[PDB]
Design a protein around this ligand. Structure first.
Ligand SMILES: *[C@@H]1O[C@H](CO)[C@@H](O)[C@H](O[C@@H]2O[C@H](CO)[C@@H](O)[C@H](O[C@@H]3O[C@H](CO[C@@H]4O[C@H](CO)[C@@H](O)[C@H](O)[C@@H]4O)[C@@H](O)[C@H](O[C@@H]4O[C@H](CO)[C@@H](O)[C@H](O)[C@@H]4O)[C@@H]3O)[C@H]2NC(C)=O)[C@H]1NC(C)=O
Ligand SMILES: CCCCCCCC/C=C\CCCCCCCC(=O)OC[C@H](COP(=O)(O)OCCN)OC(=O)CCCCCCC/C=C\CCCCCCCC
Ligand SMILES: CCCCCCCC/C=C\CCCCCCCC(=O)OC[C@H](COP(=O)(O)OCCN)OC(=O)CCCCCCC/C=C\CCCCCCCC
Ligand SMILES: CCCCCCCC/C=C\CCCCCCCC(=O)OC[C@H](COP(=O)(O)OCCN)OC(=O)CCCCCCC/C=C\CCCCCCCC
Ligand SMILES: CCCCCCCC/C=C\CCCCCCCC(=O)OC[C@H](COP(=O)(O)OCCN)OC(=O)CCCCCCC/C=C\CCCCCCCC
Ligand SMILES: CCCCCCCC/C=C\CCCCCCCC(=O)OC[C@H](COP(=O)(O)OCCN)OC(=O)CCCCCCC/C=C\CCCCCCCC
Ligand SMILES: CN(C)[C@H]1CCCC[C@@H]1Nc1ccc(S(=O)(=O)Nc2nc3ccc(OCC4CCCC4)cc3s2)c(F)c1
Ligand SMILES: CC(C)CCC[C@@H](C)[C@H]1CC[C@H]2[C@@H]3CC=C4C[C@@H](OC(=O)CCC(=O)O)CC[C@]4(C)[C@H]3CC[C@]12C
Ligand SMILES: *[C@@H]1O[C@H](CO)[C@@H](O)[C@H](O)[C@H]1NC(C)=O
Ligand SMILES: *[C@@H]1O[C@H](CO)[C@@H](O)[C@H](O)[C@H]1NC(C)=O
Ligand SMILES: *[C@@H]1O[C@H](CO)[C@@H](O)[C@H](O)[C@H]1NC(C)=O
Length: 1116
């Protein structure tokens, strides 16, 4: 018995047999069930049971150190087998998790142990971050609950008819009329009722309507609000993750007022730019530790011909990129003839090289094998669709292009780790797809009526392909809309599922991928006086002040300016004065530093360009020609030099300046790869996004209009999609929309509906086109776009080393030791006296640990009391809650009084004591103020705002938490640099705000631009640009500002400005903004955070921390 089992388990054939069985079982899990599946399930279960029996007979069960159930993997196997028997003999919710056995297949890929260990270490290291995350989210949920409670229910309700059609006024008849949903404003074909508010700057109502509270439901089937702590929690988590967050942001600003933008800024700054970067830092440290452990453990043959072939390759690529939809016949002939010529040249090259060199030596070269494969494919293509393989020719450019060559060699050097990570990602997606299919698939079929028109949504769980696509989309960062659908037809189980998918896929696996990338990709007197004046402090301060004031004046030139004559005059006068000022300043600087210094400096060149622009505008105005707006807007660029001199800014600007060349190289490589995908996209989809519509832009059925001829015979419209693959430029724009995941859903809907040209698309007739986008997303968004962060991280570390005056050649250990030696230099001990029988007794009672723990418990209880508040509660409940809060305030005041009585003046030697003392004083003053306000009823919003001080007494809960204290210390050390980065971001936003006001203030309402969100004033422009800095909603903004169709041109004689945008201008504006902010400046936060977190953690683990010195001086 025992001998057989012991020999059987160690035989490799046994392990391969089990693995192959698991693989076929997974395959059968993908396909639809049938009676044959039931018997195959029994076969698989028998095989797994035999494995369990063999291993128990070989090891024993638990009682010894090396028994069967001392290995976690065996725990997985055993629990899944038991679940299988349980579900076979006797809830279907348990039948899914047999797919968990597939996790074992991770052990097939060589080098799997490193990645699995890194994942395990990352998961175990998030312990303190989870607690801090939950606390922060709760605090923000409370703040949002008190600020936005009830706002998302606002609606425009028609006035009670004075005509008497609804009867004479009575309170009952008025309530009866206002509650009828047919009297609530909603534009035709809309799903959601628009929000409103009567505060200055909120959404307005049409005439005959008033903005009311308490009617109807909240947005998104009632799932989006701040009416309870739980929904507020959900909304805050959504906001931190940036998941469709522009919609909640616009809803709140439209119902509450633009000033509530402040709330969103705070949440985005703390939660997105700091905390998720803590998560990334933990993942990076874990991976670095594992890799450290692993590593420690241990004619034709001439340059001229090469150049000739290189230019021929470039010309062939150009010819390939020129292909487009509905080409004229001459264009087609030219391209075809060019193809013939290129193929002939490649054939000649192959033969010449094979004969000049030996055939044996010819096929010993990898590049030669690649070229021969290309020649074979080309000749096969011309002989006989093999055109898709023509793209291989593009990759020959890597032989001649050193940057691309190095990029390729780096990938070759470490392909194994990336293979492991991608396999883990896809295995996780497969497991979740199967689980979600079993849990939710039948809900969509059974409860289809609940959907807006009773139709199945594009994204569902009805079969394996759709389930995989929806979980993959969640991994890309979009989870909440799918969760709304799941809840609508399901129950609470949808919430944990999607959250888990998002957390594991996005915050762990993708972060691990970027960690891999980082690890791998990483007269004489006149000159005298002018010189003295130029170097003088006061003169520079005066110049800076003038620049700042006139730049602020630019922000006031909004759409209302023509109605304000005094402002018009002030701006004109300021323009004249600035012209004189710039000229005189240029002369002074020239006399100070001279011609050669002046004209070899980039700063002085910027100044000179501004001087020339203002002189040109002056000459134009003299001639009677209206000044160019762009030229006089160029003066804002003067702000950057004084900005670069702010305290602590030098590290940030040095990092960006040093990073520019690498960023450019990455952009070039990305353009190359995107060219490959764009040519493929044109080949697949060019000309196929046309469809037949009617007066309402509603797609007709193919059963009615089969093709273009039917469409036009019935006098319908054969309209193209604004985003398409008709030529390479449009393909590039569509691929940018895909990679950023902004507007990609419509593009993919068109792609999977596509049929041959001139035919009516059919829903999901070409579903497997999804594979195209998956590949692009893996190689364009997960790989190429994440290099920017790695570059910034690597460069910022070096620049900070420069700033602190540290040597570059020193090792990390030496710096750790120097840090400890610096700490020991500045530590000292403190003692306090225990007072006086009464005071001494109170001292003994207050200095004990029980007292502090009790204070913590009281804080937790007060926090729960705050969580009880909800929308619609009776006023009696409001009063009871306020009185309970009063009790808590009295208790904390008493704590402070006792501590003061005990410690006398020593009390203020501890910083936390000072914070608590300030909070107590503020609470007393606030109680007085609240009583006065509530009695005199100043304003409900004012009361809500001043109630924000209540959070002060809850923030003390972090006192004494060591793990949380470490991360807060890291954040404190980084605060200066984070602030400087934020300041730079805001200045860039200001520049873009004023140029956007100039370019787009008059455009018609379309897409995301409407009466509330637009470029009409500086504030509204900033509201839009803060949203756009995260790339959120930029597709709708582009659709608005790029529209050149169906518009009125300006009438200079009549003064009418016109109302439509510019495709080229909008493309330039938005693409440049996305690159500068989303891909560069925002990633600086991650760089800074990572450096500081790493420092503190290494101090904790391989050195000494301030707490070590504190403990040493506790004894002393
Ligand atoms: C600004 O923003 C506010 C929040 O978003 C919004 O409320 C406000 O809208 C409405 O503005 C008008 C002023 O033009 C204001 O009158 C509205 O409030 C009135 O509420 C009364 C409540 O009646 C109650 O009925 C219950 C029954 O259970 C009873 O118990 C209560 O004691 C109370 O009686 C309505 O009855 C009233 O309707 C008017 O009543 C007058 C009485 O004769 C009558 O002459 C009028 O013609 C009319 O019929 C109002 O609705 C206010 N909305 C709400 C919900 O209060 C918005 N705009 C302004 C201008 O404030
Ligand atoms: C994901 C990362 C999992 C952790 C990694 C791991 O396998 O470690 C635990 C351990 C191996 O430990 P070590 O011995 O350190 O490994 C060294 C190799 N000899 O493996 C196990 O116990 C395997 C069990 C893990 C299976 C993972 C399954 C993932 C899918 C989860 C689905 C969750 C569904 C939730 C939906 C909720 C709906 C209400
Ligand atoms: C706090 C700073 C807020 C400063 C804002 C200045 C606003 C000036 C102004 O014009 O106010 C407009 C307007 C008044 O509107 P009403 O007339 O009531 O309209 C009601 C319906 N008709 O102002 C507002 O609504 C402002 C509300 C802004 C709140 C944003 C809060 C941001 C974050 C708060 C976090 C605080 C947490 C505290 C932590 C701990 C403290 C110890
Ligand atoms: C790894 C990731 C693990 C994910 C698991 C954690 C999520 C579990 C959340 C369970 C929530 C229970 C749902 C039932 C419920 O009522 O919850 C509170 C509430 C609804 O309350 P009521 O107003 O009574 O609803 C009726 C009104 N129409 O539900 C929510 O919106 C809660 C959602 C919580 C979001 C959590 C996401 C963040 C988690 C961090 C990681
Ligand atoms: C489309 C309409 C709106 C378009 C507006 C675009 C806004 C772009 C804003 C950023 C650039 C503004 C112009 C700056 C000119 C730079 C002149 C100059 O001297 O540069 C070098 C100078 C070094 O200064 P020193 O005195 O040597 O050292 C002291 C440091 N404290 O650089 C700076 O300080 C500039 C820092 C600005 C950040 C720019 C980099 C970020 C964007 C790069 C992404 C694209 C790369 C490809
Ligand atoms: C910094 C970057 C600044 C960007 C500069 C852009 C300058 C403006 C050029 C636009 C010119 C223009 O108007 O061309 C329109 C013309 C379309 O004509 P239609 O009539 O629609 O053809 C019929 C379709 N059925 O061309 C285009 O669509 C051009 C699109 C330009 C590509 C923009 C995307 C760039 C992607 C950046 C690379 C990202 C990867 C790097 C990492
Ligand atoms: C019960 N009832 C009839 C009265 C009766 C007694 C007097 C008060 C009580 N009413 C009540 C109690 C608690 C909250 S409360 O639960 O919201 N707690 C809050 N704590 C703080 C703490 C400080 C603060 O202002 C500080 C700033 C004001 C200007 C500058 C400093 C405001 C708040 S409000 C509230 F709203 C109001
Ligand atoms: C230095 C860095 C780190 C922080 C920068 C400060 C911002 C938080 C400031 C700078 C400009 C401010 C904006 C200036 C103008 C406005 C318009 C204001 O609303 C109005 O225009 C009210 C009138 C109306 O809506 O009718 C709302 C506040 C807002 C967006 C301000 C909100 C706060 C902003 C973004
Ligand atoms: C108004 O009253 C009628 C009956 O008089 C009732 O059927 C209807 O539901 C009421 N509408 C409301 C309360 O919105
Ligand atoms: C709303 O008003 C319309 C028009 O009078 C009426 O037909 C409808 O029944 C009303 N709905 C309710 C719920 O009262
Ligand atoms: C367009 O929509 C409106 C509102 O549903 C409808 O009345 C009209 O008949 C529609 N037009 C066509 C051509 O279907």
């Amino acid at each position: 018995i025992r001998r057989v089992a012991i020999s059987t388990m160690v035989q490799p054939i046994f392990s391969y047999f089990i693995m192959i069985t698991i693989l076929i079982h997974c395959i059968f899990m993908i396909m639809p069930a049938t009676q044959t599946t039931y018997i195959l399930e029994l076969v698989f279960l028998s095989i797994y049971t035999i494995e369990v029996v063999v291993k128990v007979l070989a090891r024993g069960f638990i009682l010894h150190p090396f028994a069967y159930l001392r290995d976690p993997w065996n725990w997985l196997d055993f629990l899944v087998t038991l679940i299988g028997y349980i579900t076979l003999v006797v809830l279907y919710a348990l039948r899914a998790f047999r797919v968990l056995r597939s996790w074992r297949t991770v052990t097939i890929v060589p080098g799997w142990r490193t990645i699995v260990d890194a994942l395990s270490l990352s998961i175990t290291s998030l312990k303190d971050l989870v607690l801090l995350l939950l606390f922060s989210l709760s605090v923000f949920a409370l703040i949002g609950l008190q600020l936005f409670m009830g706002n998302l229910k606002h609606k425009c309700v028609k006035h009670f008819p004075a005509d008497g059609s609804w009867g004479n006024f009575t309170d009952e008849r008025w309530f009866n009329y206002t509650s009828n949903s047919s009297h609530w404003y909603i534009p035709d074909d809309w799903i959601e009722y628009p929000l409103c508010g009567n505060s200055s700057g909120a959404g307005m109502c049409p005439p005959g309507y008033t903005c009311l509270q308490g009617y109807g439901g909240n947005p998104n089937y009632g799932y989006t609000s701040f009416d309870t702590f739980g929904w507020a929690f959900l909304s805050v988590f959504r906001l931190v993750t940036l998941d469709y967050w522009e919609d909640l942001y616009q809803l709140a600003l439209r119902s509450a007022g633009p000033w509530h933008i402040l709330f969103f800024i705070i949440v985005v700054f703390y939660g997105t730019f700091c905390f998720l970067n803590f998560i990334l830092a933990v993942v990076v440290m874990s991976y670095t530790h594992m890799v450290k452990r692993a590593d420690e453990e241990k004619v034709v043959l001439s340059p001229f011909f090469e150049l000739f072939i290189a230019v021929i390759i470039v010309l062939n690529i150009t010819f390939m990129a020129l292909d487009h939809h509905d080409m004229n016949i001459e264009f087609e002939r030219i391209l075809r003839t060019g193809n013939y010529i290129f193929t002939s040249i490649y054939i000649v090259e192959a033969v010449l090289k094979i004969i000049a060199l030996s055939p044996k030596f010819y096929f010993k070269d990898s590049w030669n094998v690649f070229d021969f494969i290309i020649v074979v494919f080309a000749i096969l293509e011309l002989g006989l669709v093999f055109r898709s393989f023509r793209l291989l020719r593009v990759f020959r450019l890597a032989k001649f292009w050193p940057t691309l060559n190095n990029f390729m060699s780096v990938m070759t050097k470490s392909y194994g780790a990336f293979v492991n990570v991608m396999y883990v990602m896809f295995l996780l997606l497969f497991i979740f797809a199967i689980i979600g299919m079993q849990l939710f698939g039948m809900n969509y079929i059974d409860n289809m009526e609940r959907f807006p028109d009773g139709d199945l949504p594009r994204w569902n769980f009805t079969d394996f392909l759709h389930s995989f696509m929806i979980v993959f989309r969640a991994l890309c960062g979009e989870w909440i809309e799918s969760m709304w659908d799941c809840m609508l037809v399901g129950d609470w189980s949808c919430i944990p599922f999607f959250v888990a998918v998002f957390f594991v896929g996005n915050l762990v696996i993708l972060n691990l991928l970027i960690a891999l990338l980082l690890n791998n990709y990483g007269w004489s007197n006149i000159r005298r006086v002018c010189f003295l004046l130029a170097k003088n402090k006061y003169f520079q301060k005066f110049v800076t002040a003038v620049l700042v004031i006139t730049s602020v004046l630019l922000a006031l030139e909004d759409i209302y300016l023509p109605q304000r004559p005094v402002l018009v005059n002030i701006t004109l006068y300021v323009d004249y004065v600035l012209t004189a000022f710039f000229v005189i300043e240029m002369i002074i600087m020239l006399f100070a530093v001279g011609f050669k210094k002046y004209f070899t400096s980039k700063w002085y060149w910027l100044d000179f360009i501004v001087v020339v622009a203002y002189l040109l505008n002056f000459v134009l105005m003299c001639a009677g020609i209206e000044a160019l707006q762009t030229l006089r807007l160029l003066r804002v660029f003067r702000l950057f030099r004084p900005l670069s001199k702010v305290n602590g800014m030098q590290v940030v600007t040095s990092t960006l300046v040093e990073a520019v060349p690498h960023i450019f190289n990455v952009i070039l490589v990305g353009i190359f790869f995107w060219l490959v995908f764009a040519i493929m996209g044109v080949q697949l989809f060019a000309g196929k996004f046309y469809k037949c519509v009617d007066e309402n832009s509603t797609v007709l059925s193919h059963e009615i209009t089969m093709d273009r001829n039917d469409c036009l015979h019935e006098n319908y419209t054969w309209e193209n999609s604004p985003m398409n693959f008709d030529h390479v430029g449009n393909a590039y724009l569509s691929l940018l929309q895909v990679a950023t995941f902004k507007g990609w859903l419509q593009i993919m809907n068109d792609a999977i509906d596509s049929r041959e040209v001139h035919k009516q698309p059919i829903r999901e007739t070409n579903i497997y086109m999804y594979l195209y986008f998956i590949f692009f997303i893996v190689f364009g968004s997960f790989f190429i776009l994440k290099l920017f962060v790695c570059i910034l991280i690597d460069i910022f570390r070096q620049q900070r080393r420069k700033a602190e005056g540290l040597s570059a050649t020193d090792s990390r250990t030496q710096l750790i030791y120097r840090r400890a030696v610096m700490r020991t230099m500045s530590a000292k001990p403190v003692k306090r006296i225990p007072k006086n029988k009464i005071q001494g007794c109170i001292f003994d009672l207050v200095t004990n640990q029980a007292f502090d723990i009790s204070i913590m418990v009281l804080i937790c209880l007060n926090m729960v009391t705050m969580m009880v508040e909800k929308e619609g509660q009776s006023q009696h409940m409001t009063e009871v809650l306020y009185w309970i809060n009063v009790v808590f305030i009295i208790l904390f005041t008493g704590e402070c009084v006792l501590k003061l009585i005990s410690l006398r003046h020593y009390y203020f030697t501890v910083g936390w004591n000072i914070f608590d003392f300030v909070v107590v004083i503020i609470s007393i003053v606030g109680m007085f103020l609240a009583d006065l306000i509530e009695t005199y009823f100043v304003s409900p919003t004012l009361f809500r705002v001043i109630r924000l001080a209540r959070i002060g007494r809850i923030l003390r809960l972090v006192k004494g938490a060591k793990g949380i204290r470490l991360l807060l210390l890291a954040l404190r050390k980084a605060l200066r640099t984070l602030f400087n980065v934020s300041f730079l971001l805001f200045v860039i936003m200001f520049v873009y705000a004023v140029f956007g006001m100039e370019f787009f203030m008059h455009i018609r309402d379309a897409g995301a631009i409407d009466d509330v969100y637009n470029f009409k004033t500086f504030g509204q422009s900033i509201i839009l640009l803060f949203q756009l800095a995260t790339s959120a909603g930029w597709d709708g903004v582009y659709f608005a500002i790029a529209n050149e169709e169906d518009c009125r041109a300006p009438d200079h004689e009549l003064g009418y400005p016109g109302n439509c945008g510019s495709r080229a201008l909008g493309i330039a504006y938005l693409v440049s903004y996305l690159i500068i902010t989303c891909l560069v400046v925002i990633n600086m936060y991650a760089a800074v955070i990572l450096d500081y977190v790493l420092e503190v953690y290494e101090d904790s683990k391989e050195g000494l921390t301030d707490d070590d010195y504190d403990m040493f001086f506790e004894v002393w």
